[PDB]
Amino acid sequence: MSKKVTKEDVLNALKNVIDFELGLDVVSLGLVYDIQIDDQNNVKVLMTMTTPMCPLAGMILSDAEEAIKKIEGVNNVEVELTFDPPWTPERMSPELREKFGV
Numbered sequence: 001m002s003k004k005v006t007k008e009d010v011l012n013a014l015k016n017v018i019d020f021e022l023g024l025d026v027v028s029l030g031l032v033y034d035i036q037i038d039d040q041n042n043v044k045v046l047m048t049m050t051t052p053m054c055p056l057a058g059m060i061l062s063d064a065e066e067a068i069k070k071i072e073g074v075n076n077v078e079v080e081l082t083f084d085p086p087w088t089p090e091r092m093s094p095e096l097r098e099k100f101g102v
Contacts, residue, residue: 030091
């Protein structure tokens with residue numbers, strides 16, 4: 001019973017949601033570059049997407065917020081969407097690499 005949210009709890013929340021376009025969770029896809037969580041429980045994540053072509057991006061990103069906001073302590077929701085760097089398709093599971101073709 002406590003109110004100090006962490007990178008652990010944020011990862012564990014996001015482990016529910018799915019990127020429709022891929023069929024796995026973001027933590028599995030390895031998109032969260034960095035995760036800082038202030039002591040005012042400002043949950044603050046460098047994430048991005050595989051690509052800016054994502055189909056219903058605004059719904060996927062809204063459901064990412066849906067997980068993040070549930071964490072009973074999550075004062076505010078600083079989801080950074082860093083849209084410049086190349087991600088890496090290999091960040092997915094080894095079985096998904098062989099599946100997709102990477």
